[PDB]
Amino acid sequence: AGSMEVIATAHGGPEVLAVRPSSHTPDATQLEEGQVLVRNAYAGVNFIDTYFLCGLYKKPAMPYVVGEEGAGAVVKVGAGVPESMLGKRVAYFGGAGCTGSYAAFTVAPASALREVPDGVTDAEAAAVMCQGLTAHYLVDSSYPCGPGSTVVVHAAAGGTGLLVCQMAKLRGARVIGICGGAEKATLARSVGRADVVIDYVATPDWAPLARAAAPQGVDAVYDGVGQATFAGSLSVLRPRGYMITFGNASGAVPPVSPLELSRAGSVYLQRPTLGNFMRTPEEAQRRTSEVFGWVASKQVQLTIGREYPLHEAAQALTDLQSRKTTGKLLLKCID
Numbered sequence: 495a496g497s498m499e500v501i502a503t504a505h506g507g508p509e510v511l512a513v514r515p516s517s518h519t520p521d522a523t524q525l526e527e528g529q530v531l532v533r534n535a536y537a538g539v540n541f542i543d544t545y546f547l548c549g550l551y552k553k554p555a556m557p558y559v560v561g562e563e564g565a566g567a568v569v570k571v572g573a574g575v576p577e578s579m580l581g582k583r584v585a586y587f588g589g590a591g592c593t594g595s596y597a598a599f600t601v602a603p604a605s606a607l608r609e610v611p612d613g614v615t616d617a618e619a620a621a622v623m624c625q626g627l628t629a630h631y632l633v634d635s636s637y638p639c640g641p642g643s644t645v646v647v648h649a650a651a652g653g654t655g656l657l658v659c660q661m662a663k664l665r666g667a668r669v670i671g672i673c674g675g676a677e678k679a680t681l682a683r684s685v686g687r688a689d690v691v692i693d694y695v696a697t698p699d700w701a702p703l704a705r706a707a708a709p710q711g712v713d714a715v716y717d718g719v720g721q722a723t724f725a726g727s728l729s730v731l732r733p734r735g736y737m738i739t740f741g742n743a744s745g746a747v748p749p750v751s752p753l754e755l756s757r758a759g760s761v762y763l764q765r766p767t768l769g770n771f772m773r774t775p776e777e778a779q780r781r782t783s784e785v786f787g788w789v790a791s792k793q794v795q796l797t798i799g800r801e802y803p804l805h806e807a808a809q810a811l812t813d814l815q816s817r818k819t820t821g822k823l824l825l826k827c828i829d
Contacts, residue, residue, distance in 0.1 A: 498829070499597035500807040501557040505549040508808040511560065518599040525572030529591075530604050532584060534827035536620035536801065537595035538563030539810045541743055547811070550746060559594030560807065563587050565610065565620035566600070566827070575604045583610040585619040587627065587768055596807050598827055605775075608782045613790035621796050621822040622657075624768065626785045628740065629657035631771035633665050634781070636764055637714035637736040641666035644708045646715045646730055648723055649743065650686050651678035653797070653822050658716050659686030660794050670707055672700050672723075678819060685795055701726040714738060721745040733759035740766050797821045804829070 497516035504510045523531055542562055545551045565585035571577065584607040586592060591603040610619045633639040639662045647662070649655040650671025659682060662669050671688035673679055679693040690707045694700045704712060711732030717723055718741025728737055737755075739747055747765075755761055772778045788794035799821025802810045810823045 496829070497598035498804055499594065499599075500560045500804060500825075501594075502547055502553075502560055503557055505547065505556075507544075507548065508811040510547065511808045511811075513805050513807075516598040517559075518593060518597070518601055520570050520599070523570065523599070523601065525570055525601070527573040528575065528603055528605070529572040530568055530575055530579065530584075530602055530607060531570035532564065532566045532586070532600045532602055532607070533569045534564045534566035534595060534597060534600055535616040536565050537561045537597070537804075537825040537827055538565075538620040538624055539802075539807075539814055539823035539825060540624050541741060541814070542624070544811060544815060545742060550742065554590075559597050559600075561588070561595035561597065561825070562592075563620060563624045564595030564597075564600055564827070565616045565623070568607070569599075571604070579604065579607075583616065583619070584608060585610050585623045587623040587772070589769060596804065596825055596827075598804075608778065611786050611790065614786050617798060617801065617824055618789055618796055619786075620824055621798050622785050622789060625654040625822065626657055626789075626794075626796075627772070627781050628654055628768055629661050630781045630785050631766065631768065632658055632716050632738060632740065633662045633667070635771055636716075636738045636740070636766050639665035639667040639714075643667035643713050644670065644710060646670045646672060646704050646712050646717075646727070647686075647688070648672050648715070648717045648719045648727070649741075650682035650688055650691060651819060652718070654718055654741070655716075656682065656686045656797055657794065659688045661788075663687045664788065664793060668708070670704050670712070672704070674817070681797075681819065685797055701729045704730045711735070716740065719744045721747050724750075728755070728758040728761060731759060731761045734761060735759070736762045736764065738764050738766065799823055801826050 722744035
């Protein structure tokens with residue numbers, strides 16, 4: 495009973511998680527300059543949570559409060575932060591200076607907080623900060639989708655994949671989704687709005703099929719899957735096309751010889767991370783305004799699955815690593 499948070503007690507899988515009382519309640523928290531205390535309504539569940547949990551990515555300390563992404567309201571501000579921020583609805587995708595979002599209360603730098611508009615719910619905000627802003631920069635910056643573009647999207651029925659499909663379509667591109675199983679393919683076609691969907695259970699040789707569908711050539715591949723798809727993804731690109739590897743789901747990509755990228759056709763390789771696309775207030779506001787606007791105006795459809803109670807964070811991470819369609823998973827932070 496009361497304000498809780500979820501901590502990692504060691505590296506590993508969901509078994510290492512434990513629930514404890516919140517260590518950042520308002521009455522116990524002395525905010526430093528620039529810091530803000532957020533009362534979370536929801537934490538978003540993300541693959542990156544599992545990479546910190548297992549050790550592929552490194553946290554500054556152990557134990558630590560799990561979770562990157564959250565949405566809530568400002569309840570306390572430190573020096574140099576305006577009082578007008580108190581009570582404002584904010585969302586964040588995490589980073590240094592942020593404590594974990596799997597928690598009743600999170601400390602974050604004021605600069606990491608994005609204001610949530612009145613027309614977007616707390617749950618929608620916690621669904622878009624990581625996956626929605628990643629989909630935004632993928633089709634806006636990593637490879638700038640336009641009416642002349644054809645792109646391939648891996649895991650097109652997953653959380654980020656469905657949003658990449660929709661936002662690339664909104665930019666005018668032609669979208670070729672790849673995913674596994676007939677139900678995921680239906681999802682990528684109906685919610686993702688992909689032009690073509692290849693089901694690699696039905697057709698395991700997906701690379702020649704993508705190329706045959708795009709005689710004009712594939713300009714970019716958005717591949718969040720990692721090592722298992724890397725070589726096939728390179729093989730579908732037109733010369734000087736873009737390989738955008740932005741996830742590790744099947745395992746991190748091993749080292750690549752540059753001369754191998756040469757033999758694939760002088761292609762570009764990028765391994766982006768969201769922080770490099772949220773670098774200034776103007777860029778951060780442009781991305782959140784556009785995504786929030788698309789959600790509120792219902793031009794982008796979010797696919798939100800279960801809202802777990804906070805103490806079932808282990809189950810949510812387990813369900814996340816299942817091969818099953820789950821929709822965006824959220825944790826309800828307020829009991």
